[PDB]
Amino acid sequence: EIVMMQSPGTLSLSPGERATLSCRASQSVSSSYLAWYQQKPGQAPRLLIYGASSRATGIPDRFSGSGSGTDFTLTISRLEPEDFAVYYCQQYGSSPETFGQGTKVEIKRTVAAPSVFIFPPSDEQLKSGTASVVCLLNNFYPREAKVQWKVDNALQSGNSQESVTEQDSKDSTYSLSSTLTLSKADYEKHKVYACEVTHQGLSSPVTKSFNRG
Amino acid sequence: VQLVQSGAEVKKPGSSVKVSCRASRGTFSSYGITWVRQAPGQGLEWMGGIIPIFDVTNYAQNFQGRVAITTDAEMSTAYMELRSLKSEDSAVYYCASDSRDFSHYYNIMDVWGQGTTVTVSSASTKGPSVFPLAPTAALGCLVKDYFPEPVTVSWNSALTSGVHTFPAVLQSSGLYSLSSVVTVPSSSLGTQTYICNVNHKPSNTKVDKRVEPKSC
C-alpha cells in the first residue's frame, strides 16, 4: 500500500504569510487521485483540492495544489485567521486509500518560557487509594516541552499522562498539565517528588519538587 | 446537501455498532460513499467505500471480516457496521460523498457528515471525584475518574481570565480525568474566595469545590 508522508509536522507562521505544505508518496500516485483536506478542532474535514490541483466548490483561491508523481504541494498564498488548522493529503489512486499524517499550521510568536507549578496529592484525595501529582506549565511557546517525573530521583515512566490546551486565541501560547499517578501505598513509600521541565525558553531545565509530609 | 450521521454511541468490547449516514438530498448512486475514522488525537484513516462504477465495496485490511458498508434500497442512507469492537476502535467515524450525486470518475468526498463518536469501553457511567489543587499564584481542581465524557468546569463564573481547563486524558482504568487551573495574584489569596463548578451530565453530578490556601 502507498504511504503518504507530510512535512513539516508543524508549520509555524504569522497571519498573512505564505504556507507551503508537502505531501510525498512512497510510490508514484496518479495525479487525478490526490486530495487535500482541512480540519479545525472538533469539526469534520473539508475538501480543499482534488485531482492534485482542482479547487473544490467555494474554496477561496488562496488555496492551490500542484505536483505529480510522488511530490505534491498545498500552498496557501496568505494565511487568514481561519486558516490555522490541520491539513491532510490523501491518495485514492489505489486501494487501500491512504492519508498523510497531517500538518498543523500554528501561529508563530516569540519564545515564552513556561511558569512551572507542582501540586502534591490533595489531603482529600489521600483518603482514596490513589495519589495524583500534578505539574502545570503555564503559557509557553513553542509547543515543544519535556516533563520528566522523578520519585526519590528515580526517573519515572509508564505512569504519567499529559494534556495540552489549544493555542490561546489572545496570546498564542500553550499550557500543559502532567499528572503522575501512584497507589497511595507507593506514594507513602517515597519522599521526594520532582517535576523536571525542559523548554527552549529556559536557560537550563527547571525543577519543582516537594517532600511528602 | 448535508450528510446526517447517527448520534454518539458507547459500546462494550465484543459488541457491534452500526453508524448511519443519511443524504438530505439525492442518493449515493453514481459515486458511492466512503467511511473514514479518526482516533482521539490521531490522523484520518480510510475504512472503506462503495464504488458504484465498479460495483464493489472495498475495505481496509485491518478491518476485513468485521466491517460491512451498505446502503438502504434507495441508496440515500449508507451504513457502516463494525463488529467485535475493541477499545482501539474508539474514534469519530465520518462518511463522505460527492456533491454530483445531489473527471474525476470517483467520489471526490466534498460533502462530509458531521462525524459519529464511538467510545468502546467496559466502564459504566461514573461521576468524578473533585479534588482541590491548593495554591501570581496558581490553583485548580482535579476532576478524576469519570465516564463517559464530557464534564464542564467554570470558576463562578466572575473569573475567566487566566483559566485553563485541559482536555481529558483516558486512564488505563478506562475512566477519564482532567484538571482545570487558574493563575491569580498572590495578594488575592485569603482576600478572595475561589470555587470550581463541575458538571457531569451523564452521572447526575454537580460539584462545587472551594479551593483554599494550605496554611501550615
CATH number for the domain that contains residue A177: 2.60.40.10
Residue position matching grid coordinates 489531603:
A123
Whether residue A99 sits in one domain with residue A148: no
Query: B134–A122: do the CB atoms touch at under 8 Å?
Result: yes
- Say how far apart CA B149 and CA B202 lie, in whole Å: 8
Q: Which amino acid is at B95?
A: C
Is the distance from CB of B84 to CB of B63 less than 8 angstroms?
A: no
Q: Are residues A118 and A104 in the same domain?
A: no
Same-domain status, A72 and A120: no
Based on the fold, state whether residues A60 and A135 are members of the same structural domain.
no
- What's the 3-state SS for A10-72? EEEECCCCCEEEEEEECCCCCHHHEEEEEECCCCCCEEEEECCCEECCCCCCCEEEEEECCEE
Residues A185, A130: Cα–Cα separation, whole Å = 8
For chain B, give the number of residues: 216
d(CA B157, CA B197): 8
Q: A115-119 and A130-140: which strand pairing?
A: antiparallel
Q: How distant is the Cα of A86 from the closest Cα of chain B, in angstroms?
A: 10
CB contact under 8 A, A96 and B46: yes
Q: Among B26, B29, B72, B32, which Cα is nearest to B48's?
A: B32
Which are the contacts of B32, defined by CB distance < 8 A and separation ≥ 6? B49, B50, B51, B52, B97, B98, B107
Inter-residue contact B155 to B143 (CB < 8 Å)? no
The two most distant CA atoms of chain B are separated, in Å, by 76
Rama region for B172: left / alpha / beta (φ>0; ψ in -120 to 50; rest): alpha
Size of interface A-B (CB pairs under 8 A): 121
Are A36 and A123 part of one and the same domain? no
Chain A: residue whose CA lies nearest to B138: A117
Residue A178 grid cell: 502532567
Are A73 and A128 within one domain? no
With an 8 Å Cβ cutoff, are A161 and B171 in contact? yes
- Residue (of A126, A55, A164) closest to B134 by Cα position: A126
Are A162 and A178 members of one domain? yes
Q: How far is Cα A171 from Cα A107, in angstroms, rounded to an integer?
A: 10
Cis peptide before B185 (omega within 30 of 0): no
The H-or-E segment that residue A181 falls in is strand A174-183
Distance CA B177, CA B41 (A): 16
Domain B123-216 sits in CATH 1.20.1250.20: no
The answer for residues whose C-beta is within 8 angstroms of residue A34's C-beta and 6 or more apart is A23, A50, A51, A52, A65, A67, A72, A89, A90, A91, A93
Cβ atoms of A183 and A129 within 8 Å: the answer is yes
**What is the spatial distance between Cα A192 and Cα A152, in angstroms, rounded to a whole number?**
5
- Co-location of A4 and A91 in the same domain: yes
d(CA B189, CA A116): 19
Helix (H, G, I), strand (E, B) or coil at B61: helix
Q: Are residues A84 and A120 in the same domain?
A: no
The whole domain housing A128 covers: 110-212
Experimental method: X-ray
Domain ranges of chain B: 1-122, 123-216
Q: Of A61, A86, A109, which one is at a domain's C-terminal end?
A: A109
Phi then psi for B115, rounded to 5 degrees?
95, 150
**Is B1-122 CATH 3.30.450.40?**
no
Q: Distance (Å, rounded) from C-alpha B84 to C-alpha B105?
A: 34
The values of phi and psi at residue A170, to 5°, are -95, -60
A14: Cβ contacts below 8 Å, ≥ 6 apart: A79, A107, A108
Structure-derived torsion over alpha carbons of residues B132, B135, B139, B144, reported in degrees to the nearest 10 = -30
Strands A103-107 and A10-13: parallel
Closest of A100, A103, A104 to residue A26, by C-alpha: A100
Contact B118, B11 (CB under 8 A): yes
Distance (Å, whole) CA B38 – CA A88: 12
Q: Which of A77, A109, A141 is the last residue of a domain?
A: A109
Closest Cα of chain B to A151: distance in Å?
20
Mark whether A168 and A199 lie in a shared domain: yes
Mutate to test the interface with A, among B33, B51, B102, B109 (most CBs of A within 10 A): B109
Asked if A139 and A77 sit in the same domain, the reply is: no
Same-domain status, A28 and A18? yes
Q: Which residues of A touch B34 (CB under 8 A)?
A: 97
Dihedral angle sign, alpha carbons of residues A19, B166, B17, B122: positive
Tally the domains of chain A.
2
Does any CB of chain A come closer than 8 Å to the CB of residue B61? Answer: yes
Q: How many beta carbons lie within 10 A of that of residue A94, not counting itself?
A: 14
Within the 6-35 window of chain A, which residues sit less than 8 Å (CB to CB) from chain B?
Answer: 32-33, 35
